[PDB]
C-alpha cells in the first residue's frame, strides 16, 4: 500500500535568478533525482524506469524538460502580473503523484505551496485555490486555467500515466521494497537512559524499556531519523533515579529479527 511522491522546490531570488530541484519517492525509498544543473532526470535505483520502454521514458523525460523551462518563465511572468503586490524572494513547492491501493485503485494528487503554505491544487479538470488561500491568486488561477493544452496533459499525467508507471515500479522494485535489515542496538546514559536502535528496515519498529516483564510506561520514543544507506535510526529514552538502573533492559521488536527479539541489560 505505497505512495508515489514527486517533490519539487523552486527558489526565485530576484527576477533573473532561479533554480528548480526535484526528488521522487516510492514509500520511503528515493527513485529519482533531478537537480537544476542536470539536463536529464537521474535514476537513483536500477529499477527507476519501472516497466517503461526506452522510447516511452525519453518522451516522458522530454515533456518534463519542457515543463521545467516553461514553469520557470511562467512564475517570473506571473510575478510581473501581480506586482507590486507580490515580490521576490519566492519559494514554490509542488507535491504530486498517487497513492496505490489493491484492485485497480489509486488516487492522484497535485498540491502547490507558495512561501511554505499550501495554496493551490489541480483537481478534476482545472487548477483551484484551496481554503485559506489569498484571493489575489484568482488572477493567476484564471490565467493558468485558460491553457487547455496544459490541462489535458496534467489530466493524463494524473489519471493515467502516473498509476500505470507506479504499478510498473512496484513490480520492478519489489526486492528493494521488501528488503529486511536488522536493527543493532546499544545503551548509554546522561538520570536519563538511552536505547539506540539503528540499521533497520522497513520503518515499523517497537522499542520499550523493561524491568523483566513490565513495560516501563515512562519510555519516550524520539523521531525516526534516516541513515545514509536507506535504513532507519531511533532512540527510546527513560528517566530514572541513580541506584535504580539495576534490572532495566531495552527490548526491540522488528520484522527482520523473525521472532527472536533483541534484549540488552544494563
Amino acid at each position: 500500500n505505497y505512495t508515489f511522491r514527486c517533490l519539487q522546490m523552486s527558489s526565485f531570488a530576484n527576477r533573473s535568478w532561479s533554480r528548480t530541484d526535484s526528488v521522487v519517492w516510492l514509500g520511503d525509498l528515493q527513485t529519482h533525482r533531478w537537480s537544476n544543473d542536470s539536463a536529464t532526470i537521474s535514476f537513483t535505483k536500477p529499477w527507476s524506469q519501472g516497466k517503461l520502454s526506452n522510447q516511452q521514458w525519453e518522451k516522458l523525460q522530454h515533456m518534463f524538460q519542457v515543463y521545467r523551462v516553461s514553469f520557470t518563465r511562467d512564475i517570473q511572468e506571473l510575478v510581473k502580473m501581480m506586482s507590486p503586490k507580490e515580490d521576490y524572494p519566492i519559494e514554490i513547492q509542488l507535491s504530486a503523484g498517487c497513492e496505490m491501493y489493491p484492485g485497480n485503485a489509486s488516487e492522484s494528487f497535485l498540491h502547490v505551496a507558495f512561501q511554505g503554505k499550501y495554496v493551490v491544487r489541480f483537481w478534476g479538470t482545472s487548477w483551484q485555490t484551496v481554503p485559506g488561500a489569498p484571493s489575489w491568486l484568482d488572477l493567476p488561477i484564471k490565467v493558468l486555467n485558460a491553457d487547455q493544452g496544459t490541462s489535458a496533459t496534467v489530466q493524463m499525467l494524473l489519471n493515467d500515466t502516473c498509476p500505470l508507471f507506479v504499478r510498473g515500479l512496484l513490480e520492478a522494485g519489489k526486492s528493494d521494497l521488501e528488503k529486511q535489515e536488522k536493527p543493532v542496538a546499544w545503551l548509554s546514559s546522561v538520570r536519563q537512559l538511552v536505547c539506540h536502535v539503528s540499521g533497520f528496515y522497513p520503518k515499523p519498529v517497537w522499542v520499550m524499556w523493561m524491568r523483566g516483564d513490565q513495560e516501563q510506561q515512562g519510555t519516550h520514543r524520539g523521531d525516526f531519523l534516516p541513515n545514509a544507506d536507506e535504513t532507519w535510526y531511533l532512540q527510546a529514552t527513560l528517566d530514572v533515579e541513580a541506584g535504580e538502573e539495576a534490572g532495566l533492559a531495552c527490548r526491540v521488536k522488528h520484522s527482520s529479527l523473525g521472532g527472536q527479539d533483541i534484549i540488552l541489560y544494563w
Partner: T-cell receptor
Amino acid sequence: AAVTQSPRNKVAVTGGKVTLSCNQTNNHNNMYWYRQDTGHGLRLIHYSYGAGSTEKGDIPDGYKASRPSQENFSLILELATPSQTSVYFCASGDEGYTQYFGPGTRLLVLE
Amino acid sequence: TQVEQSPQSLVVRQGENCVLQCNYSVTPDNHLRWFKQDTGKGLVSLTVLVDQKDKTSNGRYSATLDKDAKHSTLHITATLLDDTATYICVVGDRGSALGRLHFGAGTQLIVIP
C-alpha cells in the same frame, strides 16, 4: 474586440519627442507594443499586465512605456532617432493566447 | 531566428494555386497562426492551428500543422488579384496570455491578373 492607434502616420525630427498611443475598450488587462521592420517579423518592445505595469520586451532600448489606465498604452520615444523609423503595432488581450492587433502606425524620423 | 518562411517571395498568374511553407524551432509550440497583410495595412488572421496534426480551411485558404516536424503550410486555391500581400507565420508558445508570439518575416505573394 477593437483596438485603435494614434497617430496613424507621423513625421518627426531626430531629438524630438514622439508618443504613440494605443486605445482599447475591451477591458483587456494586457497590452503589447511591437515594431515591424522589413526582413524581420514583428518584435516586442514593451508590454503591460495592467494600469501602472510596464515590462521590457525583446528590444526595449530607446523606448519608454506608459499604462496610465486600462484603456491606454503609450509608447514614448524621448529622443527619436532614424533607427526608430518603422511601423508600430499595438495589441491587447485577456488571459487567453489571442492578441488582437491595431491597424498600425507609420513613423519616419528624419535627420 | 526561430521561425522561417519559404519562399521569400513568389509571382503567380491569376487562377493558379500556391503553397507557402513555415518551419520553426520554437519550444513549446501551442498554436500557429497565419496572417495576411496588404501593402500599408493590418494583420488579418486567416487561420489558427492548435492540434499535433491539424488541418483548417477558410474558403480558398487551407492549412496544415505537424508539431513533430515543426512544419506548417498554407495553400491558396485559384488565386485572385486581392491575394497580392505578405503572408505571415506566427507561433505562440503558450495556451494562455503568459505566451510570447514568434513571428516569421513573411512571404511576399504577387498575383498577375
